[PDB]
Design a protein around this nucleic acid. Structure first.
Ligand SMILES: [Mg+2]
Ligand SMILES: [Mg+2]
Ligand SMILES: [Mg+2]
Ligand SMILES: [Mg+2]
Ligand SMILES: [Mg+2]
Ligand SMILES: [Zn+2]
Lengths: 81, 62, 186, 150, 129
RNA sequence: AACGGGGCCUUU
């Protein structure tokens, strides 16, 4: 810790750092793609859900909002892109 | 009753002038309200100039 | 209606026309490669020396049409680069640039930010690469004082430009007079 | 730091580096705006419009992918409200802090907190007046404000 | 609130290089930082610097070679006559031999000697040595 | 060769 690389820092330390504290502030949030217990229709849901999102018809509960990433319900799928 | 008007004249000269106000701005929200549907029309007539020859040129080139 | 000389505009020239007749041959295959490729045309074209064993071909565009030029793009450059070898095909934008007013340039008509020199150059390096959205950038200021704008390219599906980096570097040099270097995530 | 409190807290939203995209979207921008005004003609604030859009409908930002920003969208569709939700919620709060204060005038914290909210309102309105979005008269006033909510 | 943006920079530079570090992270980046950083680096008192693009006002990374005593700023940026550059240069510079008072003329950023040859002048900016 | 002053071209 005298001379180091600020231009090319390791992502080992940079990914445990703060969202604003990376060399360029990144979003730490992602986007799912989800279905029902019984339905194929794919909802595009945000990783941290302030709203309680529904899958459209038959008025389901996909996720209950938290102080953070939404808490999903029982079982259903997810894909991070 | 709040002693706003010295005599009877100053009450009508205020009423008159007052009607001459809200009807002066009724005609501004007429004329300046007219050029809004001039440019929701003349601007959306240009949406059927540019989009009706592109509708055509997709069909008209076979 | 003449298909061959409509699609360009000035009058000329023998190479600009040669590339035009190449689109014509691609304008007949399948039903959808015709009428969708039909409306998409281009302005003039420059050819400038690349220090490699090839040259660079700049196709300028009126830029409403980068909307549909992008929709094909790679479809054409996985084709037009087979049509013309020892040459590198690029799709640019002829967007105008209004200078910086003081006195010798005077009296209003504003200056929207697109049409600004620096903001425009940043949209040329967006259109030299066209796929592979840039994930970051930076600029080195030399010890002689000059610059290298270090363009940090994406990774996923970068192989389409994986070679031509010289040809993008040579384009921005024959325009801006300042240099470029690319890179990736390790 | 904070204006009207002690805190220095930096909790915020950190936007990604992209001026276009994401690629997985494919949602055809004109379809987005319809969903915006589907919510807007149903009367949802542009702050809370992008709350559902970003969540339910998978929109990173209205800034990109619509070319334009939510209230600057609603404005172009003629759904622009009377006052910005900036002032609106500031007034919407201060009013209720006064209504609660009419029943309790020995509650001195709200009296003190009132002065904070009200000072914000006048400083915001001055700005909004300066940049012309508000009529140069305007001037929020206590007993006419419960009309600006209801 | 952050009011100089340049003085916030030259401090961070001056700080670390006086604690022995070779590299410094500046933010945000004024074009006036850059022109100052230029005259610094071209006169040797610092190394080479790399602009960083956020979607924000952007950062910088400056390599420190040592050898730099102080980089600084005069806020307010005074108006300076030409004869009054001599009375500035005698004040904050270590010796008449070396050292640089850096102004901002209508011709743009430069040092006091570079100003003297051109016979221009402007507002003051900072110093380097 | 260090530096200074005046004009062209580069989408002006
Ligand atoms: Mg009267
Ligand atoms: Mg802070
Ligand atoms: Mg305070
Ligand atoms: Mg205060
Ligand atoms: Mg912010
Ligand atoms: Zn459901």
């Amino acid at each position: 810790v005298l001379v180091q690389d600020l231009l090319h820092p390791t992502a080992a330390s940079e990914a445990r750092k703060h969202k604003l504290k990376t060399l360029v502030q990144g979003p730490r949030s992602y986007f799912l793609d989800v279905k029902c217990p019984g339905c194929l229709n794919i909802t595009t849901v945000f990783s941290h859900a302030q709203t309680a999102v529904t899958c459209e018809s038959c008025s389901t509960i996909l996720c209950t909002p938290t102080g953070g990433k939404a808490k999903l319900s029982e079982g259903t799928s997810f894909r991070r892109k | 009753k709040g002693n706003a008007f010295k005599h009877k004249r100053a009450l009508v000269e205020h009423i008159i002038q007052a009607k001459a106000d809200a009807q002066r701005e009724k005609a501004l929200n007429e004329e300046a309200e007219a050029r809004r549907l001039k440019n929701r029309a003349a601007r959306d007539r240009r949406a059927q100039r540019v989009a009706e020859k592109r509708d055509a040129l997709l069909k008209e080139d076979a | 209606s003449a298909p061959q000389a409509k699609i360009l505009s000035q009058a000329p020239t023998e190479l600009e026309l040669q590339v035009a007749q190449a689109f014509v041959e691609l304008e007949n295959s399948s039903p959808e490669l015709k009428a969708e490729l039909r409306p998409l045309q281009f302005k003039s074209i420059r050819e400038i020396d690349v220090a490699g064993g090839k040259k660079a071909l700049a196709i300028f565009v009126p830029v409403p049409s980068l909307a549909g030029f992008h929709k094909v793009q790679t479809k054409l450059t996985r084709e037009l680069e087979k049509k013309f070898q020892d040459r590198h095909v690029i799709f640019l934008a002829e967007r105008r640039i209004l200078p910086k007013p003081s006195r010798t340039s005077r009296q209003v008509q504003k200056r929207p930010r697109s049409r600004t020199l620096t903001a425009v150059h940043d949209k040329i390096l967006e259109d030299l690469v066209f796929p592979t959205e840039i994930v970051g950038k930076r600029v080195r200021y030399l010890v002689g004082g000059n610059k290298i704008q270090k363009v940090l390219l994406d990774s996923k599906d970068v192989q389409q430009i994986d070679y031509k980096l010289e040809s993008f570097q040579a384009v921005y040099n024959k325009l801006t007079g300042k240099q470029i270097v690319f890179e990736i995530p390790s | 730091g904070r204006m009207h409190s002690a805190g220095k807290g930096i909790s915020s939203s950190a936007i990604p580096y992209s001026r276009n995209a994401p690629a997985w979207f494919k949602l055809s921008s004109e379809s987005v705006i319809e969903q915006i005004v589907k919510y807007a003609r149903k009367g949802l604030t542009p702050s809370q419009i992008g709350v559902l859009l970003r969540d339910a409908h998978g929109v990173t930002q209205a800034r990109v992918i619509t070319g334009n920003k939510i209230m600057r969208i609603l404005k172009s569709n003629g759904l622009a409200p009377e006052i910005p939700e900036d002032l609106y919620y500031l007034i919407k709060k201060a009013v209720s802090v006064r209504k609660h204060l009419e029943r309790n005038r020995k509650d001195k914290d709200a009296k003190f907190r009132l002065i904070l909210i009200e000072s914000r309102i006048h400083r915001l309105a001055r700005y909004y007046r300066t940049v012309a979005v508000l009529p140069p008269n305007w001037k929020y006033e206590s007993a006419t404000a419960s009309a600006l909510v209801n | 609130t952050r009011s100089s943006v340049l003085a916030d920079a030259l401090n961070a530079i001056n700080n670390a290089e006086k604690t022995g570090k070779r590299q410094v992270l500046i933010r945000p980046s004024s074009k006036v930082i850059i022109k100052f950083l230029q005259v610094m680096q071209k006169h040797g008192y610092i190394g080479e610097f790399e602009y960083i693009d956020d979607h924000r006002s952007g950062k910088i990374v400056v390599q420190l070679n040592g050898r730099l005593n102080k980089c600084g700023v005069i806020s307010p940026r005074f108006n300076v006559k030409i004869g009054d550059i001599e009375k500035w240069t005698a004040n904050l510079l270590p010796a008449r031999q070396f050292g640089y008072v850096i102004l901002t003329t209508s011709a743009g950023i430069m040092d006091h000697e570079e100003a003297r040859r051109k016979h221009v002048s402007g507002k003051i900016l900072g110093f380097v040595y």
